[PDB]
Every structure is written in C-alpha cells, then in structure tokens.
Amino acid sequence: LKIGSHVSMSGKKMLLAASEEAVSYGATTFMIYTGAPQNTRRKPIEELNIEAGRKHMEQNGIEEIIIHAPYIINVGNTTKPETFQLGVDFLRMEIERTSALGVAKQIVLHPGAHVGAGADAGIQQIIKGLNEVLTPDQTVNIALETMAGKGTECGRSFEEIAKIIDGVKYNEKLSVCFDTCHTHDAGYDIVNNFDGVLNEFDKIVGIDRLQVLHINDSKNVRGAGKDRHENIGFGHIGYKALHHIVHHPQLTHVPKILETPYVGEDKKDKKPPYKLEIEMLKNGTFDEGLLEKIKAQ
Ligand SMILES: [Zn+2]
Ligand SMILES: [Zn+2]
Ligand SMILES: [Zn+2]
C-alpha cells in the first residue's frame, strides 16, 4: 500500500524536512511541490538538500515520491504569449529538478484553463505547450491531473485528458493523476460505481497511464465542480468508496496521496490529518471521531 500525503520543503532542510514530515505520518510515499505551489519561484537544485533527504527516505523505507508543478502554470493560455511561454520554461526546469531527485517518476500538472477560448482551443494550446516541453529521452513523466471542472479548467473529463495525450508526439512521457475529489466533482459516480468509472477510464485513456492517485473526500455533491477537499469519510464520497479506491486490486502499485484539509475549527490553528486518516484507511473501518482525535496530538 503505497500511501502518503502532500508535504513541505521548508529550506534549508528542504528535502529532509519533506521526508521527516512524511515519516511522522507513517507514510510510504509522499508528494512535494519544488517550491511554493502558488508561484514559480524556485531554489536551485543545489539547495534542495537532496542527498540528505534521499538518505533519510532510504532509512525509513520511502522509495518513490511525487512532484506537483505549481498551479499557476497555464499552457492553455491563448491571449498572453508570455504566460504560455513561462509555463513551457518552468516545466522544462521542473523536469530537470525532478530528474535530479533520483526517485520521482512523476510531475503532476493541471493541464490548463482555457479562460474563455473554450476547451477545444485551450486543449490545442496545452498540446502545443507540451510538445515544446517534452523530450523522447526524459526520465520523468508528466502526470496530467483529472480536474474538477472549476472555472475554465481543461482536463475535466477523460475525453479531454485523452485528447491531450493523442495530441502530443512524445505521449509515452505522459501519465495521469486521478483525483477522487475532482472526478466526483466533475460528475463521475465513483461512490456507487468507481469500478465502472475505472473501466471507462481504461477505455478512453487506458489504465496503464493512471500513475498517481489523489485521495480526497469532497465538501460538495457529485457534479458541483467546486474542488473543495474534505477529510476522508466526512464528505460526499464517503469512507466505503474511498476505501475501495485505496485498496483497489488494479491499483496496488499506484501511489496514493492524501491532499485532505488540516483540522482545527475555528480560531486555532490547525493540525494535519494524514497520520490518522492513513491508519483509518488501513484499518478498514470509519472512525466517526477521527476529527476529534486529529485535534489532540
Ligand atoms: Zn493538483
Ligand atoms: Zn489533486
Ligand atoms: Zn482539488
């Protein structure tokens, strides 16, 4: 059960900090941004303390980790040539960083937002951006994230993902990241028919491309397109369904990353749920009082 969470690189520990945090949640994998998620803005490869972080991951059994590219990257942009160009450039640097970790195979990327050009146009730009980024001999894939359909996001259906993959010439370097919150919010019934939804994914996109799993419950109903994550089992997806995904027989080798919200109503401040959530999902039974246990620790 390859399972972990979003963690942080603090600097100057950087990578060592990510790995300690993950270890402290009892995590077997984890996910990092290379930098702040909301900007671009990055320390050189030399300052990521990779040797030390890799040493601590060996010692505590972590073999693979995930990278998520910052979410301001929009290679779907058609009106500001420099935003498109900025995304190509950064992805090129990001592949270099990630490569420079030894042991991240994947960079999660929000495909893009068409921001008024409509999906077709946005998707053609993403193909174009990707075709400018990718090399046939790069050693890390880009994992296109399943999007919730919020605002003008492209990647909101499997058909949109597949369309992007078919567009790019080095598509062997493309994977996908299946986020449970997003797919639910985008209207797929992963609650009483995840097996069906997986089959569809396999037909449209192909299950071998499903290389990252984001395990989030959701604050909103199916189809809401709101991308508001919730703690495991306390949302609209619920424990049975999330548990089923986590332990799915076809997904044993794929790393599961919780991106669930920290806990602490409402003037504090503000505790990570990952340790307890992970163990609850291992235990196979819903802990009605998990939120109150998360608050003390
Ligand atoms: Zn994401
Ligand atoms: Zn996600
Ligand atoms: Zn989300």
Parallel, antiparallel or unpaired: strands 174-179 and 210-215: parallel
Return the SS3 of 68. strand
Residues near ligand 3 ion, CB 5 Å cutoff: 227
DSSP for 107-147, written as a single string = EEE--EE-TTS-HHHHHHHHHHHHHHH--TT-SSEEEEE--
Residue 106 φ then ψ, to 5°: -135, 140
Helix axes 274-283, 239-246, angle to 10 degrees: 80
Give yes or no for a contact between 261 and 291, defined as CB atoms under 8 angstroms apart. no
Cα–Cα distance measured from residue 286 to residue 277, given in angstroms and rounded to the nearest whole number: 10
Annotated binding residue 227: yes
Task: Return the domain boundaries, the chain.
Answer: 1-297
Q: Which amino acid is located at 119 in the chain?
A: A
Annotated binding residue 110: yes
Please count the other Cβ atoms lying within 10 Å of the Cβ belonging to residue 64.
Answer: 17
Cα(132) to ligand 1 centroid in Å equals 22
Give yes or no for a contact between 51 and 19, defined as CB atoms under 8 angstroms apart. no
Return the SS3 of 240. helix
Q: What's the number of CA atoms in the CB half-sphere (13 Å) around residue 162? A: 12
Annotated binding residue 179: yes
DSSP for 94-109, written as a single string = HHHHHHHSSS--EEEE
**Resolution of this structure in Å:** 2.6
**Structure tokens that stand for 26 in this block:** 């009892």
Which ligand sits nearest to residue 69's alpha carbon?
A: 1
Give yes or no for a contact between 181 and 227, defined as CB atoms under 8 angstroms apart. yes
The conformational region for residue 258 under phi > 0 = left, psi -120 to 50 = alpha, else beta, is: beta
Q: Name the nearest CA neighbour of 105 among 251, 255, 228.
A: 255
Annotated binding residue 68: yes
Cα(110) to ligand 1 centroid in Å equals 6
Q: How far is CA 194 from the centre of its chain?
A: 19
Give yes or no for a contact between 112 and 72, defined as CB atoms under 8 angstroms apart. no
User: Is the domain 1-297 a CATH 3.40.50.1220 member?
Assistant: no
Cα(130) to ligand 1 centroid in Å equals 17
Cα(32) to ligand 1 centroid in Å equals 11
Cα(263) to ligand 3 centroid in Å equals 17
Cα(7) to ligand 3 centroid in Å equals 15
Annotated binding residue 145: yes
Return the SS3 of 230. strand
Contacts of 223 (CB under 8 A, 6+ apart): 185, 186, 187
Which ligand sits nearest to residue 144's alpha carbon?
A: 1
Q: How far is CA 168 from the centre of its chain?
A: 21
Give yes or no for a contact between 130 and 164, defined as CB atoms under 8 angstroms apart. yes
Q: Name the nearest CA neighbour of 85 among 68, 69, 70, 73.
A: 73
Residue for token digits 């601590």? 56
Cα(129) to ligand 3 centroid in Å equals 23
Annotated binding residue 182: yes
Cα(66) to ligand 3 centroid in Å equals 16
Technique behind the model = X-ray
Cα separations (Å) of 110 from 13, 20, 50, 114, 246?
Answer: 27, 27, 25, 12, 22
Cα–Cα distance measured from residue 253 to residue 257, given in angstroms and rounded to the nearest whole number: 13
Cα separations (Å) of 53 from 23, 66, 78, 148, 227?
Answer: 12, 14, 39, 33, 31
Cα separations (Å) of 290 from 71, 232, 276?
Answer: 30, 9, 7
